[PDB]
Design a protein around this nucleic acid. Structure first.
Length: 150
RNA sequence: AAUUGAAGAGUUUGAUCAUGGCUCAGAUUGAACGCUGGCGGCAGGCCUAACACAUGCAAGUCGAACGGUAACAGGAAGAAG
């Protein structure tokens, strides 16, 4: 019931004294399938150590999302660095139809059938960060009615 | 009951993030070309030279408008084997 999946692995470099030194970065997202989404970055010298650090950071640093029946509630826009992201609840608008690196976080998030369209930059490290910010500041009808009295 | 509706990716760098262009994945067509080709249904078929046109048809009808008889088939009368 953990439901982990990796989005992006890259080879970064460092350029020391004698030549270059190549390191690998993972970027994974875990989530239970009912709210509870996390992402982790993690970087290491080989690929399986990188993904393992990424999963291990992603299992902690996990955020609650106030889902609807199987989906979002109201249309929400989350931004991070250069990466602006729209989402629309699509009240059984079948299938998760999101961009790459947004399909994954929305998939393990437990949502099933939203409409997305990322704008701006679509770097995978910043398009999540713009989905969680997004799903984090999406509030439910029992939270809005809690705030404003009824 | 009559709008249930939105996906990205590759490429600037030793690597990064951003900006930014180029390019790809889709659908479409009065299409052409290449390879191949069994049947049917429904549609479509000179986008260019509003260039030049052989030949055949594409606008005739009415005698219940009229003088009339060129034919065709009868009618009447005459003459002949």
């Amino acid at each position: 019931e953990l439901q982990e999946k990796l989005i992006a692995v890259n080879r970064v470099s460092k350029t020391v004294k004698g030549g270059r030194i190549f390191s690998f970065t993972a970027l994974t997202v875990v989530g239970d399938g009912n709210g509870r989404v996390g992402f982790g970055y993690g970087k290491a010298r080989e690929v399986p150590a990188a993904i393992q650090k990424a999963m291990e950071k992603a299992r902690r640093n996990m955020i609650n999302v106030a889902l609807n029946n199987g989906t979002l509630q109201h249309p929400v826009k989350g931004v991070h660095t250069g990466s602006r992201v729209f989402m629309q609840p699509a009240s059984e608008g079948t299938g998760i139809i999101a961009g790459g690196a947004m399909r994954a976080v929305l998939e393990v998030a437990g949502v099933h059938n939203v409409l997305a369209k990322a704008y701006g930059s679509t770097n995978p490290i910043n398009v999540v960060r713009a989905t969680i910010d997004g799903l984090e500041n999406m509030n439910s009808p029992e939270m809005v009615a809690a705030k404003r009295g009824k």
